[PDB]
Design a protein around this ligand. Sequence first.
Ligand code: ZPR
Ligand SMILES: OC[C@H]1O[C@@](CO)(O[C@H]2O[C@H](CO)[C@@H](O)[C@H](O)[C@H]2O)[C@@H](O)[C@@H]1O
Length: 684
Amino acid sequence: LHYPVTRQGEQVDHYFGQAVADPYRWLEDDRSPETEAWVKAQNAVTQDYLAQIPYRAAIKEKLAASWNYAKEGAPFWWGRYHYFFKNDGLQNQNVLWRQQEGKPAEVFLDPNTLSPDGTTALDQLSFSRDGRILAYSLSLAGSDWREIHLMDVESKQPLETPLKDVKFSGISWLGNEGFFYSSYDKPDGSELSARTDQHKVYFHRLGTAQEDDRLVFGAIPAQHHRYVGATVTEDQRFLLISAANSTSGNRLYVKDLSQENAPLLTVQGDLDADVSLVDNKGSTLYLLTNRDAPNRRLVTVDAANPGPAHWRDLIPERQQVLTVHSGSGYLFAEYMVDATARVEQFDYEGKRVREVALPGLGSVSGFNGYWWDPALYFGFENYAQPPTLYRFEPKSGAISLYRASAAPFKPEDYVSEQRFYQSKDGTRVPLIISYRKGLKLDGSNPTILYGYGGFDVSLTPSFSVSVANWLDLGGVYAVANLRGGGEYGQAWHLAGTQQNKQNVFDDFIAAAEYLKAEGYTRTDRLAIRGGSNGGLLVGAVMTQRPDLMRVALPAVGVLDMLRYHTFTAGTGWAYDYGTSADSEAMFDYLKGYSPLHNVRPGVSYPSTMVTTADHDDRVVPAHSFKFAATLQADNAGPHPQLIRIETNAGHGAGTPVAKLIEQSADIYAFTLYEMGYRELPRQP
Ligand SMILES: O=C[C@@H]1CCCN1C(=O)[C@@H]1CCCN1C(=O)OCc1ccccc1
Ligand SMILES: OC[C@H]1O[C@@](CO)(O[C@H]2O[C@H](CO)[C@@H](O)[C@H](O)[C@H]2O)[C@@H](O)[C@@H]1O
């Protein structure tokens, strides 16, 4: 195996006076011909390696055939039409259809006709109140940047010129006059890696040029924030503006639109808690918050004097984490019970109406709608159960099947069991293990252990065609609900942040030890996988315990923990990670686990396939480039250290089906091949 030559530069950084060498610093320049040439060379080596795997084509065909079935989402009613997304089976992007009573359904907006390779994706959709205009945002090549387009709803004709430089933005209409959106000024330098830290809310009035858009929030010094959002309430009475510097905690302001020149009132003026508006009933605001509530609570307050001192509990905090949805005049409290959903229906006075029975143990979607929706829809799924849609009539509580899955997977063929293993410090951590029935605990099953562990993100059961295929190939898929996550509230999250981050890695190592001890797998039949913060997870575990697994799959990972805060909106992760600029203690702790700085020459690393994408502006690909370069230079063992750079794709959202299939095929082929399989374990 011949890796491309990666030169080592002379760059040396200093942290509180301590020197740290960065030989691959030049790979951070995403626009240099040198970096572009290195990417092509690496991809060529990776493709040549994968080309030697005899069953890679079979895996890809197996995946494509099983993915090829009709899919349809819940209907959305607006104006004279009902809108719904559909995919005939293998369309790169889902298609937006619509239908009005008395007439046949028709294609309304087909993203597949917007690019030659299915890489342009539809993100936000927001109709004007009269239903005559639609504003929608599009992502190009998968980056976080967006363009907002406008179209006449009835004729489908494009209107005006698209708005540019939109990012991390919703689209909220003020009647039919125009809409609010968020944007960062175009950075000087590469828009894919340059730092952006001053998010602004603008208002676009129909019939004008974007340059004339009114600046609403975020320009004056006192309002500078890395993340800002503005939403007009359903009744058009209030404008809510949220503002934050990190992914946890936010300020919230409310402006009475009924009053002329109404001042911005402070709902929450500090960043010590997360607070969001669920809905409003007149001047009464319903807020979901973790302020003085680790597992969250729902409170109410009058918009005229909305401060925290006046918040009153409506749904008090419980032992389980709360999320609140609203629709049809009811509040739906979704609780997490060991990472699985339970739903309770409440009226706006906080009185419990009933518990909503769910089809089983898994995740739910939906239960969200307007006060005027006669019925609500919700979806249910888990690792062995493809998404199923149900219609729910809130008043009677009647539940009916709206759409059964057309997937070629039979839930009854699989086992999905939950266990709680002990981490190093004694903490019991949840683990959901899925596989085809008939499995023997003889320690030989090829297994993929997946985790994330951070940012209050909870890994609840979800159906994946790719995962189901791994199970059909005879594999075991195990998902750990590591600390750092939000499964058990804020305490669970904080136990995996800053100088406690090692707890997350310890939790993951313990999951791997449990799977081996119980006989599901063994060292040479184990692979670990994770993306973004989960990519860091894999990078840290493989550098700390390179003997623990056979295969490491870090996807779009944060791997240079000393410089991650210097790119795009990376500083927004400082609440979870801390930064090398915080103090000598934080710098030492970060350097102590930073994957890039813990690869050592002479060590034999497991087979690794680092994956990233050229338009990933969430986590710049340079993290992956420098890490892969270091592994190729330092690895002393016989196992391959490869990097696969997806072209015309980003962090992940909106990736076309065609690319998703190729990626999964490459990952599974590589994993089985590195585990020594000469043929597939089961008939494809
Ligand atoms: O191609 C299948 C791979 C091998 C086994 C699990 N896989 C996955 O892709 C799983 C299931 C869906 C999310 N996922 C994943 O790895 O996500 C990584 C990620 C997480 C967060 C942001 C970007 C990317
Ligand atoms: O594990 C042996 C098995 O591996 C295969 C398929 O990958 O070839 C590998 O091992 C060979 C040495 O036995 C190497 O020469 C070859 O490059 C490597 O891919 C099978 O051919 C062999 O039976």
